Subunit: 333 residues, 3 copies
């Protein structure tokens, strides 16, 4: 590892993913990343409910880190003195030391640097895991995805090449916001004060909200995802704590690795796939019709009532062979 060239990657905010190559002629590198933890109160719904949140780099989810199989990930994790809690990081993509958590315990005002070999291809969850407060840090927002691409790019079941033209990252967060005697959601002055009440809601296993990217409607309106007919999108979906079942309304998973590990053949033509709590998965879809699609958790209560749904606005020409309104709504003859 010490013989290798180093490279420095600038991260970008979800739902985007930082520029990267798929298939590459480059040999292994030590790829250097930095993330800074930010605790903060966030508004998570249309009615102004707040979450005492914890984030990597200020976002839910954290940014997606992209490397290739055989690369070494070298992360500097920074925990500013303005934060209240200790933190660390557990990479599911890593081998040893509780995913790196044991080696990255950072109090406010501290930082650490971890290196590990990304020797397995796939999308992998990373998350905070401080001893004794693991679920709280995770459900409060401290997770994201490491994508380790195969050096020669994605392959189908027959070993033929697959690619995406555009990649999006979606983190789905089951939230456990307490209510007071009046049935209204509680607003907490500090992160520490939210703790006890939150654990109580957590233990019921019933989320109050389930949101993409930190808020009801985060991926809608001005913030809808975008594509054009003929473009192939990669949709990375992470859920660090609870199962979900992604679905693209009016579309499909053309090729899907629902367990998220690229050395396995993908499945094709999926209507709905399954992301296990504690994992990230990946779906390819090539758009064939223009219009506004919904991308959602297909427990439709979890989607429409609780918040697990976004939109993708697709430009291009309508295709009558694929779908045609033969007769519009009109009185019954």
């Amino acid at each position: 590892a010490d013989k290798l060239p180093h490279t420095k990657v600038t991260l970008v905010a979800p739902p985007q993913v930082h520029p990267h190559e798929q298939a590459t002629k480059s040999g292994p590198k030590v790829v250097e990343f930095t993330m800074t933890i930010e605790e903060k109160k966030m508004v998570i719904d249309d009615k102004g409910t707040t979450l005492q949140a914890m984030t990597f780099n200020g976002s839910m989810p954290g940014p997606t880190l992209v490397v290739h199989e055989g690369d070494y990930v070298q992360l500097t994790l920074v925990n500013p003195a303005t934060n209240a809690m200790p933190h660390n990081v557990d990479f599911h993509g890593a081998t040893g030391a509780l995913g790196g958590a044991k080696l990255t315990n950072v109090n406010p005002g501290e930082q650490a640097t971890l290196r590990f070999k990304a020797d397995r291809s796939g999308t992998f969850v990373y998350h905070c895991a401080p001893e004794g407060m693991v679920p709280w840090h995770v459900v409060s927002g401290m997770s994201g995805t490491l994508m380790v691409l195969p050096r020669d790019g994605l392959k189908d079941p027959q070993g033929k090449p697959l690619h995406y033209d555009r990649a999006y990252t979606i983190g789905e967060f089951d939230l456990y916001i307490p209510k007071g005697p009046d049935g209204k959601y509680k607003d907490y002055a500090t992160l520490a004060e939210s703790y006890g009440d939150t654990v109580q809601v957590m233990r019921t296993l019933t989320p109050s909200h389930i949101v993409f990217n930190g808020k009801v409607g985060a991926l809608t309106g001005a913030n809808a995802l975008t594509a054009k007919v003929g473009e192939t999108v990669l949709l990375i979906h992470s859920q660090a704590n609870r199962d979900t079942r992604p679905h693209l309304i009016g579309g499909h998973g053309d090729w899907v690795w629902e367990t998220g590990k690229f050395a396995n053949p993908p499945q094709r033509d999926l209507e709905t796939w399954f992301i296990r709590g504690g994992s990230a998965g990946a779906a390819l879809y090539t758009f064939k019709q223009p219009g506004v699609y919904a991308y959602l958790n297909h427990n439709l209560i979890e989607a429409f009532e609780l918040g697990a749904a976004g939109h993708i606005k697709v430009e291009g020409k309508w295709n009558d062979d694929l779908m045609k309104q033969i007769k519009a709504p009109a009185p019954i003859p």
Copy 2:
């Protein structure tokens, strides 16, 4: 599509599936179907609890529509003036326009005709999805399965032929029936009056009932499914809103497409498979022993307490090689 021969299919009520060919020499057709929406109060359990239900063709689930890959599905959806609500249809088997929902918005007294190309093989959920009331219409009963068979029939992982002699369709419905201050289930005079109370139960994510084909015990007694030793059955299982885990007690999934998409190799020898909420899956089993089998959701609370279980009565000769009572129950020596 306009060059093709049209064919007209008569639908049948679940658990049966309309006569169809598996492997076929026929070229692509425009296959024409009609469904009429019926809202109605249904009795859903042994104690007389009612559901203000909504159905395609009067049944939960709707009838299964069967075509071949490359066919065009052409559906006339009828919403009689005797209904109270608007409806539409979203085919997961279709590409574009939110699965056809945007093109099939029918008020009571209206109808519409949608065509789409069934270009992907598998079992696919179809369901009602009116803007702003999607989960309610789905959980109230408005879903079913489109089966798109490969033109050359089902294949195993090695590409060898598979077939069924008999097909059954099972729709599993998580119901959210409200209770009054007395703890008794509420009985509603109209569909509209059930709405607010139902959404409240929905948001708890805890079903009051989980039933096959519209009622506790729907597929039991006089209504048990049937087969004989040596016959291969296809069990189509749809769940449009919530995960389930089918299991045949005393049997197996000989070949199972749990994600329901026939271009993928099936898995063999399954004890229990997994249907993601928002999908339909398909299992083949060839009976080897006679007797009454249970086919159920293997969360046994969901099965035995909540209603997710049916029976299959199997004729034929017992096989001592497969199973033998060596010593019947008798006092401990």
Copy 3:
């Protein structure tokens, strides 16, 4: 079957699995086992909560039975007069008679002997299933795993040999312990007295506890699982009633059959896999780093709050290529 040699297997208590061969030159046998049912009150958590439990052989889960594909399993099931309830056994590995339940109905003071052909390879749940009380017997602890190995051992997707050096069996139990008006868990004088209150908790679908091997912390401290760097472990995970999502923190599923059926190719490099309620699955992992790993259900609430987590203590030499602390926690420059 009557022509075959008989062999007699002595069972061992979980998390161990009785000595057995993987690939074998031996032809089919009638493999004889005996299990004795024990009902008993068990302490299930750190605060002294009790469960009115029911067990095969005194343990949760029951012991794992291991045979080869083509063998006949011949089980003597004993229900001592000191027990209060009738019992039986349903082998998911078996064909006919509700998995053998119909042929093994044993009242206290009775026993029975069942034979069946283990004609399908994989890990399969077995559980008690007395008519009218199936979920109660299962959730109270009456389940375990039958492992049917392929005669020529485990194989990878390409048909190359796989093996384990050490096998562990983990049964995960969703428990439904009632509470009294004071919010404290109830302590019941007899098994029968726990019944009504328990069914009520069951119907909420919310477990009070979710535990590995009968107790919070069962597989921790003195009782942690063990291995060394370079050793391959098989982790058998059974869940007879509810879904779970196993994860090894700092490790992976090198080869995983999450549906648990060995004639299917395994998936590789998994971070988290999925065991469907009503099944057993199997993962291989070869240790590469020393240290204390956690093996847990990656719904982290279910793990850390409810009890679904154990430890594996691994001996050996640290590997800096796989992971290295480049800079330990230190003040931010």
